[PDB]
Symmetry: D2
Subunit: 288 residues, 4 copies
């Protein structure tokens, strides 16, 4: 299987010079660099082409993660918002095709972070989202991209909190390039069973994010990595595994991920590089 890491582990904002990280992760030994979709729309066609060139030259495959804004909310009861959202994903997805990216993941059926202050209509948001996703799925399938729906803990979203809910949603969407995406941090909170949640996702599991219970890099925390590896083997998983560690305070990243203490224990860039590399060796060894 292929292993990657989210560029945001080193950055405090939802964008960066991605070429810098492609080179970095290739040197550390990663197969994949995951990047935030946010800055992509603002790319000239030329920038898109070189980023793609940088990735090919360094033997790195690029995956994309996205936290939709409120106006990109496919579940919205406001038809103008669903309208804008579909337009947004259609454009983004064509860009991904030109960028040669074949996977996008996140709360793509809703938005993130969300305003939990508003009233919640789970039944109606669910129905609309299923319809909207099915439509965007035609475009994703046209652009050769898997549209991966991240199962999130209750504090970040109310629509899909367990692998079972994820599978139910995707089965309802009933379209080719829509997949369930599990994350060890979120599973850690909502699942009765980690290996059980993965077995439940089975063939709908299109992507996996990793991180310790409190988001440190994989390995020295309490996540049941051996159990996860066995469950991936049981479902014959052949997708990739991207670590999404967040250990630094500050910026929009620190605020959105809610890092209110220095979990990194003052690590500098070199120290962060070394821990990601050690987590990488650890992940290839235990998860495969």
């Amino acid at each position: 299987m292929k292993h990657g890491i989210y560029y945001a582990y080193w950055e405090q904002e939802w964008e960066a010079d991605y070429k810098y990280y492609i080179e970095k992760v290739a040197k550390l030994g990663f197969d994949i660099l995951e990047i935030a979709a946010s800055p992509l729309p603002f790319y000239s066609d030329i920038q898109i082409n070189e980023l793609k060139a940088c990735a090919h030259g360094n033997g790195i495959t690029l995956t994309v993660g996205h936290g939709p804004s409120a106006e990109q909310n496919l579940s919205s009861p406001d038809p103008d918002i669903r309208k804008n959202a579909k337009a947004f994903y259609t454009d983004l997805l064509k860009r991904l095709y030109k960028l040669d990216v074949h996977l996008i993941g996140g709360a793509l059926y809703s938005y993130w972070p969300i305003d939990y202050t508003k009233t919640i209509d789970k039944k109606g948001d669910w129905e609309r989202s299923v319809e909207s996703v099915r439509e965007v799925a035609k475009v994703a399938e046209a652009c050769g991209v898997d549209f991966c729906l991240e199962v999130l803990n209750r504090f970040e979203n109310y629509l899909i909190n367990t692998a079972q809910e994820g599978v139910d949603f995707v089965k309802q969407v009933d379209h080719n390039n829509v997949k369930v995406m599990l994350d060890t941090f979120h599973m850690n909170i909502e699942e009765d069973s980690i290996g059980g949640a993965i077995r439940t996702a089975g063939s709908y599991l299109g992507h996996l994010h990793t991180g310790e219970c409190n988001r440190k890099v994989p390995g020295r925390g309490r996540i049941p990595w051996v159990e996860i590896g066995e469950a991936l083997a049981d479902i014959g998983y052949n997708g990739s595994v991207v670590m999404e560690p967040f250990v630094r305070m500050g910026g929009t990243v620190g605020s959105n991920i809610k890092v209110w203490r220095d979990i990194s224990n003052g690590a500098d860039e070199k120290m962060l590089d070394r821990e990601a590399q050690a987590a990488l060796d650890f992940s290839r060894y235990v998860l495969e």
Copy 2:
């Protein structure tokens, strides 16, 4: 050890007929019933006396949990709010004295739930809180009440997220009746180690809340119960253990605890009672040495 359960496991609002719950948990075998503070400021003297007599007659000890409102935020930069907050706690602690309750717990150094939309000033809030808590602690002590500060996960508060931070805050407060309160649900998210967090709390641990990772009753989930019992034995834990399971959608409870699916799997009241009793048996067997 004494074992209890939060009445909210059966209810969707932050108040209820607590006498009904004292009778229920007594029959199920519990030593303690935790109740929400929310309605207590509106109890008349005889209602307080009746609640206290109900608990005594059923051999049940009452503990109190509270989620402070923004207007009760002891860490507020606004002096008027801190002033209102202290007046609120002073009245509440005196009611707790009348009720023969000796333990209050929750995010008492802050408020809950929190509007995470506002700008966060952790340093100033922390400093203000320590000072406010020091004086409320004095009232609590005079009332014979241990003032327990709950360590919460990052999604619910930003001041105190780990056992180490709670020890840091409580050592700064430096009042014997102010203690750290750990909760398996919250530790499950933030801690590098569960037994480790408990050993770090040590002599400062004044109360423990239990629940599975997704807040089901203790026992069939992934929380490391045996490791918790060993750690409690390592620190000589003298306090009590109260389960806080939340498995039902609806109402303010459902919305504040964010239960967005029927975790109880269609359980009626009798089914809820039976699972709590099995969790009680489990907790006594596994957590005690």
Copy 3:
């Protein structure tokens, strides 16, 4: 729906006892099953066999049987006279079980136990002879309404079948109705890469399960992953029973055969043994579902 039992040897230091005494004790503690040692059963008159069965019936207890074969009962032996004695022994034993109304026997029935590990080992040869011999005996077991369960043991106690995968390979090769795999948490704990995985491997072939902590204490306060076990039993849709086999006392043949060299019971008298067994029974019913 799942039935739970306990091996009478938990209270005794020799491989036999007044089983009627244990049927009554165990019925009072709440178990569904009492597991008894086969050893004394051939010495029983027809009458005592009928009254043991009436006792079990009168107390609502189901009897299961465990057996450690002697070297002369070794169905895998390269000596044809031993295989012949072995088959005769099991044919007589199985008919007696049919009369006692027991429908399950388990142990290292494909070999013998304890075994003399000083002899040179011929695993391949013993393996082939055993499959053939078990297939034969299976015909009598089927005729007697008895499931012939082959216990998977750790490397220190046997060399033929040490993992759930080897047990399944053996049982599929025997290829006969009433022959099942029997797993034991104490044994799996040593040899398996995965406990849940071993159970899922055994699957439809799992005909019986023995429980005990890593060092053979009653289930619950040890390191065995009980929740994972319960999840795996549900995954396969297990319809059999679960018998705990704790051994915590030094002394006698049981003490040396089970190799208890320290007082694991920590001074427990009979009443304390009963209480711990009952607490483990409540734990097992709750967690294993």
Copy 4:
């Protein structure tokens, strides 16, 4: 922390050309090679000096493991056996001094493997053993060697089966160079708690042997490695950690360790090297 591996992981008899293993292990990155004591009495001083020089040239530290024969049983009720046994360790410890080995471990208070058919007099053997070990320890101190007493599961010995018993025995011996040695494979069977057993050994813990529940290399099994690293940190462990994996059938090793199936799943020497190396990276990452 220094990490090693027992040469027997690649061999089926209790001897081998240790220079070959010193070179192999140094190349794989270990700090220590553990070797069996049994062929050492057959070495000339010239062989000892060249083994010592080879170890030194490759930057490898040597530790020794010994399974005493019934004739080397310091717990024997037979005074002659006790006398011979003491003579055997005196000579051995002198050889280790010559080899610059500072640690020997195993069932040094008894013998291994054990004849279990014999009558067992635990109380008697224990007292004789405490008396004998105390004497040998004066030689061990003179030779600069830590005499480490391995806590074993019940199937391998009856004298010391838990860390508490190990601590009791060493406290009663009351001598400077005697330590308790724990082993994850043995603890996995007898202990109520792994971290608890390590904290119980505390300052008496002089060495740690690692291996999964079924003796595979550390990492992909069920041993609670993070908990072990936590407990080693709690007691401020300054010793070394040597893995003792056994995944091969055949020979005296196969027979004594009771490997009755091919646990290596057809591994060739290079595959065994690779797995040892991944288990080494894992151990350094997770246990420190």
